[PDB]
Amino acid sequence: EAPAAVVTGAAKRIGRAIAVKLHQTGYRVVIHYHNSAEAAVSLADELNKERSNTAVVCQADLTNSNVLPASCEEIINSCFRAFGRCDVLVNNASAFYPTPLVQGKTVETQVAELIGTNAIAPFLLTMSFAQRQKSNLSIVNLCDAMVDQPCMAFSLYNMGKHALVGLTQSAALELAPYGIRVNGVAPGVSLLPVAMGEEEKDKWRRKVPLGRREASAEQIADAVIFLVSGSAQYITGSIIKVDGGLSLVHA
Amino acid sequence: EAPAAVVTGAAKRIGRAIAVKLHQTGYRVVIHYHNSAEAAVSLADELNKERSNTAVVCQADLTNSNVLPASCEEIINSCFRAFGRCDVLVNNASAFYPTPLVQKTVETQVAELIGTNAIAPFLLTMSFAQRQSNLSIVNLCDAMVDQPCMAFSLYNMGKHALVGLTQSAALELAPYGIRVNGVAPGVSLLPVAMGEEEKDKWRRKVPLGRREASAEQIADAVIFLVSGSAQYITGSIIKVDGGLSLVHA
Amino acid sequence: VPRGSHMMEAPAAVVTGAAKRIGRAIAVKLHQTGYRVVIHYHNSAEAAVSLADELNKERSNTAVVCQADLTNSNVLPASCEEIINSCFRAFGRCDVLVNNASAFYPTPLVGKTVETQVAELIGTNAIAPFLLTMSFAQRQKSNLSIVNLCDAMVDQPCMAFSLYNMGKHALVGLTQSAALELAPYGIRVNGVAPGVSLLPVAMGEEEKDKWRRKVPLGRREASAEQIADAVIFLVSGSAQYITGSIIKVDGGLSLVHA
Amino acid sequence: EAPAAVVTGAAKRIGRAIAVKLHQTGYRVVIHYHNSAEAAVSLADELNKERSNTAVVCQADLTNSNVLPASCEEIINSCFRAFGRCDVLVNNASAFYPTPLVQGKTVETQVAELIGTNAIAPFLLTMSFAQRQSNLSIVNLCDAMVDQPCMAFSLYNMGKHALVGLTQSAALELAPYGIRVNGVAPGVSLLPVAMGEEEKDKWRRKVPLGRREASAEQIADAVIFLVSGSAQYITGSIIKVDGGLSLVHA
Ligand SMILES: NC(=O)C1=CN([C@@H]2O[C@H](COP(=O)(O)OP(=O)(O)OC[C@H]3O[C@@H](n4cnc5c(N)ncnc54)[C@H](OP(=O)(O)O)[C@@H]3O)[C@@H](O)[C@H]2O)C=CC1
Ligand SMILES: NC(=O)C1=CN([C@@H]2O[C@H](COP(=O)(O)OP(=O)(O)OC[C@H]3O[C@@H](n4cnc5c(N)ncnc54)[C@H](OP(=O)(O)O)[C@@H]3O)[C@@H](O)[C@H]2O)C=CC1
Ligand SMILES: NC(=O)C1=CN([C@@H]2O[C@H](COP(=O)(O)OP(=O)(O)OC[C@H]3O[C@@H](n4cnc5c(N)ncnc54)[C@H](OP(=O)(O)O)[C@@H]3O)[C@@H](O)[C@H]2O)C=CC1
Ligand SMILES: NC(=O)C1=CN([C@@H]2O[C@H](COP(=O)(O)OP(=O)(O)OC[C@H]3O[C@@H](n4cnc5c(N)ncnc54)[C@H](OP(=O)(O)O)[C@@H]3O)[C@@H](O)[C@H]2O)C=CC1
Ligand SMILES: N=C(N)Nc1nc2c(Cl)cc(Cl)cc2[nH]1
Ligand SMILES: N=C(N)Nc1nc2c(Cl)cc(Cl)cc2[nH]1
Ligand SMILES: N=C(N)Nc1nc2c(Cl)cc(Cl)cc2[nH]1
Ligand SMILES: N=C(N)Nc1nc2c(Cl)cc(Cl)cc2[nH]1
């Protein structure tokens, strides 16, 4: 019978690409979403049309709060309720916006969203995933190849992504005895923000050595699929950059 | 007039040594503390005896919460209230304990470890910057975060976040002339609760002298980074670890 | 290129140090994937010829051997050009270069002269990869890539292995520099960094176990095939946006403190 | 009596600033040079005018060859010959020029010069320094930008990455002997002599902290810290002195 995966923030963009590629590889999938209900259900419908009873949706806010542990436990529970097992967790959901140090969401909200989605929710999901297995089990964290050459005024986002690197390493060490591998995929520029104009998109594209273009969502998903596959059975604690050389380019 | 520094978690151990060395170099100091009231006041007394009106205390919990931004603003404000300026911030305060992935409530663990090690440094950095010469921030990092202790996920997340803050803030505050750097101890003062046998197991791992760093040795690197000898240094993290991070399993 | 290269039908790869162990496993997996291969070797002539024979028995004239010493010297550039040349001679193209050959032995700071130590360790681990990379790039006449065999433990090195560690760090530098410079030609350059994989056959099991016990994921060394799996990924169509990346394949070893 | 230091490539630029600051701190100095004989002697004269018998020059080519071990042993010997001790080694000398992968110096020469000066000579000097053995330490001049390299500088980058490996390996191995090994990694400091004003300004404008290059003295200040009593627990560390340059994305 088929293994099952949870993908967070899977309604659109890179998370959808990961969900689709896992499903095409033979996984049953939980499509987690927050606000994108119509898109999430649309995706689940397409996947169920291909193979009945292979996709469910699960709504949760991954903002930090005193109930975030319960929400994370519930996402994992939803995989077990639907499919009776949970083999793979992909921590994809992410808030991304500037938080200038020097001078509209309050700073409290900023911290809760950016640190919650990028770091604390992955940690709590990792706890819940592990405790339900306390076979090819693994976790893949969506990192960021540019966190050592950060965008100006993105402190909280960068803190969150650096914390995610720390989680990837700490959890790899601690979960290795349970046979759970923990790895990361670090895009450079992939799908550009919906709000961004084409001229600004091209500015980013022209910086990439390998082809002067952003990664497709499928290219990111290809790295995730490698890491969950049997071809990566000895790999844990690794972060694979998928950035077209962007992080090698000086100012 | 004498420049002023805020040191978090400065009542004891490494934070105390930093406060003392900054004071000896000529700074007026805010000694932040959480629970160690007696030690904080005794330190302020000791420093004030050397030079009148050069040390104060400020109590605050740096656990993450919706009131933490206000608390951090008040820590910076305490420096301005006492000394009229704030030239240096040292983010030293830190919770440190294991948080196993397979298990205080988890939300308390998150609040304490990510609050003290990352979120409070960010909020303090924001408050410090909003006010603003030789201005700089020094973050107390950890040389061993890429080879972490088993079951310290939250602590390690907080310290990695602190590296990210050091880099992002260095970039963003450079236009204002505020340098932002880190000092990364390996093993320095070992936990008060740790038996000597276990302490010795750690000491034996250190290539340079088979001993932990004194608090003074960590403070020496902080002093360098705040000094005129480090005027072009920003976004750097200086390991002070006796080669410990070089030693394989 | 002499007629009968079948250059239109299949890609070709050079694997250095490919007679045994990890290099052999890489050559075998590339061959199994559909590549023709050059098996480079230095002293392991019987093993290299035997391997190429077995591959040719599977699919005729899909493997050749090329002997070269990769020690640094004033003839090393010519030796490296000849290795790349041998791929073009045999197969009419060279799509992949795997820099696997490596000398590995202690060189304490406090029988071989120091100059031999430098020549062997820096030659095999760094200079020969550089010269092979140059020859590979210049000869380009499409999924082209280079994979460099790095070392996951180069930031926590074995005691008294300074020259080896210097060589492996230089190889990281080459991976990054070549990724940037060759990207406009569509050549990707990546690395695979084992931790502990196949240990010396001669090493006592009791010593092997000292290393195995350090590995979080399964308390075992990687197989050569597990290392080769990462090389296969990097050369594949599933890695077409990946350049300048080094994939650790170490079972968590590099995460373990002293 | 005064400790002694060897500074490689000390006749000009950053190595000169390092030698001066060491001398000002009370060290006797060996000013190594290769081509810059007049400058080396000029510096030695200035330092000896300040304190008699505290500075000597030593000529050596640090290009890789089968006699490079002997040359490095001789540089260390020169310090013992002059001063009777050698407490500090600063590996500063460095070749720096492009070596494109795709097409008057042969590739053999390019390898020998770039890998020799930046990596192999530091290793051999480290070996000789250790073998010939207060507060002993080695400082390696690294490069803050080696993970975001200039186009077509592969051999230089290989050399500087090897130098990081040496710094780490030698710190581990020499720690039981009380020898610390550290590095200082400039970003942009003194710009190339050949570079015109427009190009120099292009590079200056990239640096977040002050939109200027490091002075040689700023680089020297970090070397001084690393050899000082204020760094006695520091080994295997590389201090970036780059004004934030390495933090700036494309
Ligand atoms: N795109 C790129 O170029 C790059 C991406 N990455 C990383 O790759 C991953 C995927 O990137 P991308 O597809 O662009 O991501 P998006 O910005 O599209 O975000 C993915 C999803 O995150 C979910 N999310 C946001 N906030 C919350 C919240 N508070 N609670 C729960 N879910 C939330 C949203 O779900 P919903 O819509 O249902 O509300 C959103 O659709 C992210 O981790 C990202 O940081 C890294 C570098 C570059
Ligand atoms: N000691 C070592 O070997 C190492 C230390 N470091 C780093 O160096 C720094 C100093 O280390 P060390 O002196 O051992 O630190 P301690 O563990 O002694 O903690 C320093 C102070 O942090 C304060 N603190 C703890 N929790 C809170 C909280 N919730 N709110 C506010 N303040 C709080 C405490 O103040 P109070 O007592 O007043 O309650 C405590 O005295 C830390 O950042 C640490 O992570 C890094 C690696 C190794
Ligand atoms: N095995 C492990 O645990 C680890 C391996 N690695 C790396 O992975 C790669 C493969 O490892 P492994 O299979 O153990 O390597 P080996 O030690 O088996 O060496 C591979 C081959 O290198 C060739 N070689 C050595 N010296 C020279 C020379 N002077 N000129 C030409 N070729 C030479 C030899 O060819 P011949 O026999 O024909 O003379 C040898 O078979 C290496 O790059 C290694 O550093 C990294 C970390 C750990
Ligand atoms: N300047 C900068 O912006 C940066 C410098 N650095 C590093 O800092 C250090 C100092 O930089 P800088 O002052 O610019 O260095 P230079 O480029 O000025 O070189 C210093 C000295 O190296 C010596 N040298 C060169 N080739 C050889 C050789 N074959 N044998 C012996 N000595 C040789 C020369 O001695 P002579 O003149 O006597 O022949 C030269 O004066 C170097 O390691 C450099 O890589 C790193 C990043 C940036
Ligand atoms: N959640 C996200 N959209 N994260 C994210 N999106 C990113 C983009 Cl469009 C570019 C870079 Cl350089 C980093 C990015 N991180
Ligand atoms: N707040 C603290 N005491 N932090 C801290 N303390 C530490 C100790 Cl005694 C050892 C290591 Cl390796 C890391 C440490 N981090
Ligand atoms: N050429 C080699 N055999 N390289 C090599 N072999 C290695 C082994 Cl057997 C263990 C570790 Cl830690 C590193 C190694 N590097
Ligand atoms: N020997 C040298 N001059 N080395 C050297 N010089 C350098 C300069 Cl003027 C800039 C950068 Cl980014 C790196 C450099 N490395």
What CATH number has the domain bearing residue B67? 3.40.50.720
Q: Point out the residues of C that are catalytic.
A: 151, 164
DSSP string, B154-208: HHHHHHHHHHHHHHHHHHHHGGGT-EEEEEEESS-SPPTTS-HHHHHHHHTT-TT
Q: Collect all residues of chain B within an 8 Å Cβ-Cβ radius of residue C155.
A: 146, 245-246
> Which of B8, B62, B76, B12 is CA-nearest to residue B41?
B12
- D68 contacts chain C (CB < 8 A): yes
CB atoms within 10 A of CB B10: 32
List C247's β-bridge partners, or say none. Answer: C192
CA distance C251 to A181: 9
**Residue B192's CB: how many other CB atoms inside 10 A?**
7
- Are the CB atoms for A21 and A224 separated by under 8 Å? yes
Give the C-alpha separation, D67 to D73, whole Å: 10
Q: Which of C97, C153, C177, C189 has the most D C-beta neighbours within 10 Å, making it the best mutation to test the interface with D?
A: C177
Please give the number of the atom of ligand 5 that sits closest to the Cα of D249: 12
Cβ of A146 closer than 6 Å to ligand 5, yes or no, is: yes
d(CA B213, CA A192): 47
For C107-151, strand residue ranges (E) read: 144-149
**Ligand approaching nearest to the C-alpha of B119:** 2
Using the Cβ of C226 and the Cβ atoms of chain A, whether some distance falls under 8 Å is answered with yes
Which CA distances in Å does C12 have to A130, A238, C30, C80, C233?
A: 43, 29, 9, 17, 16
Q: Which residue of D has its CA nearest to B180?
A: D244
Tokens of D224: 């001084």
- Total domains present in chain B: 1
DSSP B49-66: HHSTT-EEEEE---S-ST
Number of other residues whose CB lies within 10 A of the CB of residue C218? 16
A38: left (phi over 0), alpha (psi -120 to 50) or beta: alpha
C171 φ, ψ to 5°?
-65, -35
**CA-to-CA distance for B212 and B243, rounded, in angstroms?**
11
Residue A138 Cβ inside 6 Å of ligand 1? The answer reads no
Binding residues of D for NADPH, by number, are 13-14, 34-36, 61-63, 92, 94, 156, 160, 189-190
> And the tokens for C137?
């790039």
B248 touches chain C (CB under 8 A): yes
Task: Report CA Rg, chain B.
Answer: 17
Give residue ranges with CB within 6 A of ligand 3. C 17, 19-23, 41-44, 69-71, 100-104, 120, 124, 149, 151, 194, 196-198
Q: How far is CA B65 from the centre of its chain?
A: 20
Nearest to D172 among B229, B232, B243 (CB): B243
Q: What is the CA radius of gyration of chain A?
A: 17
Helix axes D107-115, C128-138, angle to 10 degrees: 140
Burial class, C34, CB count within 10 angstroms (exposed 0-12 / middle 13-18 / buried 19+): exposed
Burial environment of residue A69 by CB neighbours within 10 A (0 to 12, 13 to 18, 19 or more)? buried
CB-based contacts of D44, cutoff 8 Å, min separation 6 = D31, D55, D56, D57
Provide the domain limits for residue B156: 4-246
C142 within a domain of the structure (yes/no): yes
Contact B141, B91 (CB under 8 A): no
Residue to mutate, D34, D36, D190, ligand 4, most ligand atoms under 8 Å from C-beta: D34
CA–CA distance, D96 with C54 (Å, rounded to integer): 47
Q: Which residues contact B42 (CB under 8 A, 6 or more apart)?
A: none
Distinct helix (H) and strand (E) counts, chain C: 8, 7
Q: Could you tell me which of B183, B180, B199 has the C-alpha nearest to residue B191?
A: B199
Question: What 3-state DSSP class applies to C213?
Answer: coil
Question: Determination technique for this PDB entry?
Answer: X-ray
Cα separations (Å) of A32 from A36, A60, A113, B101?
A: 9, 7, 16, 22
* Whole-number Å distance between alpha carbons of D75 and D72: 5
* Header resolution in angstroms: 1.5
Inter-chain contacts counted by CB atoms under 8 A, chains C and D: 132
Give B19-22 contacts, CB < 8 A, sequence gap 24+: B19/B43, B19/B47, B19/B55, B20/B47, B20/B219, B21/B216, B21/B219, B21/B220, B21/B222, B21/B223, B22/B88, B22/B90, B22/B222, B22/B223, B22/B226
Rg of chain D taking only CA atoms, in angstroms: 17
Report yes or no: C133 at the D interface, CB cutoff 8 Å.
yes
Task: DSSP letter for D177, please.
Answer: G
Catalytic residues of D: 143, 156
